[PDB]
Amino acid sequence: DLLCLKDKLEMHYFGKTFDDNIHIQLIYQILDIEKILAVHVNNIVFTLDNVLHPWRINLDYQTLRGQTNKYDRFKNYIKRKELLYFGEAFYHENERRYEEDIFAILTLLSALAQFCFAHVNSFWLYQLEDQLSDEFKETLSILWEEVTERIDSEFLKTNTVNLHILCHVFPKESKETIVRAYYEFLIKKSFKNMGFSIKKLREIMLEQSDLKSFKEDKYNSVRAKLYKLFDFIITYYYDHHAFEKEALVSSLRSSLTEENKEEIYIKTARTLASALGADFKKAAADVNAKNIRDYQKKANDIGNTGIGYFSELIYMLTLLLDGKEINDLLTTLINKFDNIISFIDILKKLNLEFKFKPEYADFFNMTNCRYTLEELRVINSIARMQKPSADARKIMYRDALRILGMDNRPDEEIDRELERTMPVGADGKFIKGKQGFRNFIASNVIESSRFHYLVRYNNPHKTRTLVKNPNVVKFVLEGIPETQIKRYFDVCKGQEIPPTSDKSAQIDVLARIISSVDYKIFEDVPQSNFSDALKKQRYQAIVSLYLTVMYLITKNLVYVNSRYVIAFHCLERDAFLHGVTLPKMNKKIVYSQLTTHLLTKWYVLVKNNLQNSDITAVSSFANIVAAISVVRNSNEYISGIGELHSYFELYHYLVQSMIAKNNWYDTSHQPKTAEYLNNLKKHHTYCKDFVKAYCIPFGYVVPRYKNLTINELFDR
Numbered sequence: 001d002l003l004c005l006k007d008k009l010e011m012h013y014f015g016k017t018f019d020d021n022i023h024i025q026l027i028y029q030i031l032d033i034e035k036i037l038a039v040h041v042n043n044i045v046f047t048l049d050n051v052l053h054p055w056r057i058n059l060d061y062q063t064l065r066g067q068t069n070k071y072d073r074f075k076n077y078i079k080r081k082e083l084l085y086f087g088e089a090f091y092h093e094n095e096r097r098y099e100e101d102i103f104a105i106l107t108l109l110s111a112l113a114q115f116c117f118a119h120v121n122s123f124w125l126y127q128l129e130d131q132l133s134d135e136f137k138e139t140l141s142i143l144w145e146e147v148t149e150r151i152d153s154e155f156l157k158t159n160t161v162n163l164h165i166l167c168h169v170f171p172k173e174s175k176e177t178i179v180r181a182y183y184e185f186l187i188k189k190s191f192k193n194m195g196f197s198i199k200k201l202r203e204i205m206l207e208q209s210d211l212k213s214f215k216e217d218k219y220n221s222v223r224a225k226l227y228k229l230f231d232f233i234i235t236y237y238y239d240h241h242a243f244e245k246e247a248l249v250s251s252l253r254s255s256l257t258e259e260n261k262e263e264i265y266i267k268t269a270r271t272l273a274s275a276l277g278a279d280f281k282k283a284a285a286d287v288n289a290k291n292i293r294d295y296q297k298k299a300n301d302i303g304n305t306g307i308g309y310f311s312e313l314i315y316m317l318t319l320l321l322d323g324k325e326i327n328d329l330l331t332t333l334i335n336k337f338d339n340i341i342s343f344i345d346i347l348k349k350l351n352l353e354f355k356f357k358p359e360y361a362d363f364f365n366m367t368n369c370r371y372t373l374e375e376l377r378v379i380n381s382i383a384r385m386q387k388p389s390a391d392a393r394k395i396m397y398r399d400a401l402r403i404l405g406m407d408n409r410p411d412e413e414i415d416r417e418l419e420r421t422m423p424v425g426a427d428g429k430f431i432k433g434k435q436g437f438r439n440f441i442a443s444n445v446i447e448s449s450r451f452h453y454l455v456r457y458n459n460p461h462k463t464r465t466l467v468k469n470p471n472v473v474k475f476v477l478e479g480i481p482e483t484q485i486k487r488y489f490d491v492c493k494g495q496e497i498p499p500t501s502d503k504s505a506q507i508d509v510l511a512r513i514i515s516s517v518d519y520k521i522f523e524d525v526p527q528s529n530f531s532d533a534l535k536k537q538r539y540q541a542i543v544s545l546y547l548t549v550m551y552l553i554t555k556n557l558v559y560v561n562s563r564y565v566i567a568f569h570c571l572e573r574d575a576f577l578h579g580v581t582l583p584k585m586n587k588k589i590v591y592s593q594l595t596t597h598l599l600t601k602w603y604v605l606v607k608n609n610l611q612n613s614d615i616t617a618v619s620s621f622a623n624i625v626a627a628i629s630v631v632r633n634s635n636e637y638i639s640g641i642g643e644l645h646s647y648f649e650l651y652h653y654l655v656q657s658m659i660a661k662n663n664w665y666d667t668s669h670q671p672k673t674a675e676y677l678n679n680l681k682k683h684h685t686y687c688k689d690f691v692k693a694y695c696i697p698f699g700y701v702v703p704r705y706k707n708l709t710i711n712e713l714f715d716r
Helices: 006-013 023-051 061-066 069-078 099-116 137-155 162-169 175-186 198-206 217-221 224-241 244-253 258-284 289-297 309-318 323-349 366-380 393-403 411-421 437-446 449-457 470-479 482-491 503-515 530-577 593-599 602-610 615-627 647-662 673-683 688-694 702-709 711-715
Strands: none
Touching: 006 023, 006 530, 023 099, 023 309, 023 323, 023 449, 023 530, 023 615, 061 069, 061 099, 099 137, 099 309, 137 309, 162 175, 162 224, 162 258, 175 224, 198 224, 198 258, 224 244, 224 258, 244 258, 309 323, 309 366, 323 366, 393 411, 393 437, 393 449, 437 530, 449 530, 470 503, 470 530, 482 503, 482 530, 503 530, 530 593, 530 615, 530 647, 530 702, 593 602, 602 702, 615 647, 615 688, 647 673, 647 688, 647 711, 673 688, 688 702, 702 711
8 A cells, every 4th residue: 555554554454464455444444433433532531521520440449339438529519400401311201320330331432432532451452351340341241231222112112014914924833933034124124134136126027917006196106115025025935945045045046147147137026926915905905095194003913132341332322412413423433344345345355365463353243243233223213313311300490591692690699590590489380371481491401412512512601602793604604505494584684774685684684683682571572463483583583593603613613623533543553553652751742753754846845844743733633633622711802703604614714713822832942932922913813824734643654644723625
């Protein structure tokens, strides 16, 4: 390869040099898995560090139990009431988890964080069956036991139409079998692990008049429930014989050209049509409007087996995240494992070595990877509602009042305003006919995903400062497409301004309206006359727009920070293979040693830039990327930014301002940083030379440097 790291990686993963081009892709898939795990673990750790204002793995809970002074610091931390924001990770059925389970979850999180950012061995994740000690498997087992009882209870729904037909098709069979194979088909892909193309085979059978009588226009009413059911019968048919299917495998594997395969595919299909065409017709003739409605009325006319230890860790991680990041994580993992399966199959078919080193052998094999892939597919398909609990809603009300104005003042005044705004009366009841605000809050901010995101990632004390700089708000609104902006302007217009069709005028008016929003306006909302409905619609639009504007900024800054976290993780990984270590100087870590070691047009640029770097600046950059200090310290620097066009500029301006005020720069080694600081001061926007300088430890790969140092190439 160009990086000349093929040999090192193959020695590190297989044992010898390989003269082909199939193994490098496999090890790249492995590295991708590690990278995404590192990103998400970093995000989770920051979330925990932010929600609660404040770990040796080998500390069994019994050993730490005897210690007095050390243990008391953990008792009050676990006692904090803000742990309810994380839904089911710490609280179960309005009751706190036992101490030894929270200890297990926290210690596992710390161990994974230590493993990814690279005491634990380098092979911790790939062999957990022998390293995870006692009382730490029990926590994961209990978590999965809960979720598997829940999923077994709730599975028998949402498809109680075809299942009744499937049971009716096979009367001489146990009820488990009908449910089993049906469940084995759509949740976890048991259709994938065959060499045939049933979807292609379905079309070939449709070319025959035996079962093509269903191509009517009226058949368009039901499509998904039709094609899916034939696939179920076909895959059972191949499994039912296991000899004709085996013979078909041999016949297909012995084919000479594609013409023979097409003839074989045609010949196989025509046998199927004359075999069970009557069964297909009878199954397909039982579906209509009447049967679907009747079957749905009677939806009440086991699945727990246990999962691997690698996947239980994934579920524990899932317990501390939200829907979008859950989908991203699981999608990446599933794609990577599918690629690994395909590459192993290709390698085996070419008569080449496929065994790993003994350390990776117990995990990275065909059967284990297939099992992990199907279990990850199962983990993905759990319907999650993320409802805001029932006892956590008080804290959520307090924070919601904190965001819509009324920030940074003691809780006594909050209690006063809570009592005066929403009445209680006597005996802790609710005054009937005098509660129009509580329902509005509970329906628009308490039950909103953006509110949960802001609470988890931002301090509700100082969140209002994001929407006080006009340029930031204007850029954020400019991001939104035109139709939504027009709709919001139409709804949130008011009565004192004329209609306008220009995008810029709409952005200006919406920015003005968003600038001054407070809970005092919401103190007279209609309770339980189209004027009331219009006012309610306007208020809903305002409260949605406000939270959207904050949430977009927070999410995008987190995205950029993760993009840099990946680069540090890769640098740390590649520093080990080359045999070069990163030294220290005055307690400061020199991250520029790898690029200097590999160096000793692009050459001229890198050589010139290597003399234009401060070690203190690079170390502070590493700290900022690690702790996500941009999101935490965005309430002291966002009030002085001039003009924006992309989130890259905002991120780097914040970083440069933190470095400037915190005085994390050394003019003694070089007096040249002064010009960058002066430019930052007198233009109120980031200096491209400075970002080109402190991102120097990425010198050994040029495309990554270009992507992380040029604004136009960052998005593309």
